[PDB]
């Protein structure tokens, strides 16, 4: 019985927790132990390394490799002691002896992490180590936040607490930049000329978006000065499954599409987040082999279910069987596909999909027949202790199509998914600092473009080549009205720039974007900063519509709502 991606399983369980429980205290301290550091043994760390080693065709040098694994086992034992010292100290916090135990454990944990981290980026093996690096970096930022919140009650003096907060602040950027830089270099190494190369490249991007980049996106939340109450990051990136090939050694290379052809056909260029409303699937055939030969997609954007965007036609509109319609909705998403690729018979003349079962949270719909290629394998549910309809991690977003009519015939349907944290409603609650990426807007103003994100924000970003509007973003305030919030923007800027913030009522507000970078340098962790509107706004309608006008040279990542009280 096939196992599925155990690293994806562990990662998405961790992501679920980071989204739902990112708030200081023993619950978070025990959560990391229960989900990672008291759960993963050397057996499983081996798989972490090997999953990347197989993708890049490079085994970590053996001494460095066993050094990493035993170092991770060392951190597990230390973190067990740390959690134990915290549970103890929590019950009798004034006890000077318990306070000394925690100060000892923290000092031990921090030192072990300071020395272990470089062993997770050993020269020439940084990519293969990257998913264990991100786990150690995460643990490090978490205990540095721990001391920033509790260190005084543990008995640390003011200077060392300030020193650790300065460490947290610098290392958010250092760890972020290392993960993104290493990820980009791993991707570059997998660029090649042919479709066979694209398959590996596309798998790498999926597997490391989930096991590394998705965790990096939460790193800024560990800054308690910036996020003094609970906050949740939305992962808005699209992740893609595989082309419907069984044998992925596509030979000879000359008879198959190029790398650029596949990338350009399969990966949607940057856009506002959308959600599946329906597929219309057209069945075609070659002699007696029937397959998914083309389709339309109908999508809606966040908060606005009634304005559907119809895709251009993918593939051909065959008539071998009547068109089939597959539907989803905001609260009835499709969370699982079971695909039957034609290549399950080595003799079929088309590379494509003979059938798919779609499972939604209520019922099922089958295009032609069910198959064994299971979305749960690469995108497992974020909670396995509960039914799949309750515990899924991703919702079916879109489907693209690599078409080759001549040569070996290709009907390359590929499914794309959005993570559960990117809800189809931008909800703002007075008990959270709410983060809303601007790609969750529902209109894109003319002259505004969605551009590819750097890698650490969790999704794509907005900019303009000349001053003007981004587009309207819809919000629903939950709970008893009225509510008052400070507005804050995460942005990057090549110069001192400004903008204007509007909602559907007449008071508008100027926003400033002090320079964060130089024109022409790449976006890196420190290129993004926060800017705050210090006049709070009070809202009294549940549904609200926001606009942002910006000058050029500004990149917008997200808007944030900081409750004035509660």
Numbering used by the authors: 28 to 593
Relevant lines from the article:
The Cry1Da_7 protein described here was identified by applying methods similar to those used for improving Cry51 against Lygus spp.. Cry1Da.844_8 containing the S282V, Y316S, and I368P amino acid substitutions exhibited a 50-fold improvement in activity toward CEW while maintaining toxicity toward FAW. The Cry1Da.844_8 and Cry1Da_7 proteins have 100% sequence identity in domains 1 to 3, and the full-length proteins were observed to readily undergo proteolysis using trypsin (data not shown). The resulting activated cores are comprised of the same pore-forming domain (D1) and same putative receptor biding domains (D2 and D3); correspondingly, their receptor utilizations were expected to be the same. The FAW activities of the Cry1Da_7 proteins with and without preproteolysis were comparable, suggesting that their PTX domains (domains 4 to 7) do not impact their stability or their receptor utilization in feeding assays. Consistent with this observation, the Cry1Da.844_8 and Cry1Da_7 proteins were also comparably active against FAW in insect feeding assays. There was no detectable difference in insect responses between the Cry1Fa-SS and Cry1Fa-RR colonies for both Cry1Da_7 and Cry1B.868, suggesting that the Cry1F-resistant colony was not cross-resistant to either Cry1Da_7 or Cry1B.868. Potential cross-resistance of Vip3A-resistant FAW to Cry1Da_7 and Cry1B.868 was also evaluated in comparative dose-response bioassays between susceptible (Vip3A-SS) and resistant (Vip3A-RR) colonies. Both Vip3A-SS and Vip3A-RR colonies were highly susceptible to the Cry1Da_7 protein, showing 50% lethal concentration (LC50) values of 11 and 12 ng/cm2, respectively, and all insects were dead at concentrations above 316 ng/cm2 Cry1Da_7 (data not shown).
Two new modified Bacillus thuringiensis (Bt) proteins, Cry1Da_7 and Cry1B.868, with activity against fall armyworms (FAW), Spodoptera frugiperda (J.E. Smith), were evaluated for their potential to bind new insect receptors compared to proteins currently deployed as plant-incorporated protectants (PIPs) in row crops. Results from resistant insect bioassays, disabled insecticidal protein (DIP) bioassays, and cell-based assays using insect cells expressing individual receptors demonstrate that receptor utilizations of the newly modified Cry1Da_7 and Cry1B.868 proteins are distinct from each other and from those of commercially available Bt proteins such as Cry1F, Cry1A.105, Cry2Ab, and Vip3A. Accordingly, these two proteins target different insect proteins in FAW midgut cells and when pyramided together should provide durability in the field against this economically important pest. Taken together, these results support the conclusion that Cry1Da_7 and Cry1B.868 are effective insecticidal proteins against FAW that have the same pore-forming mode of action as other three-domain Bt proteins but bind to different receptors, suggesting that they would control resistance and increase product durability.
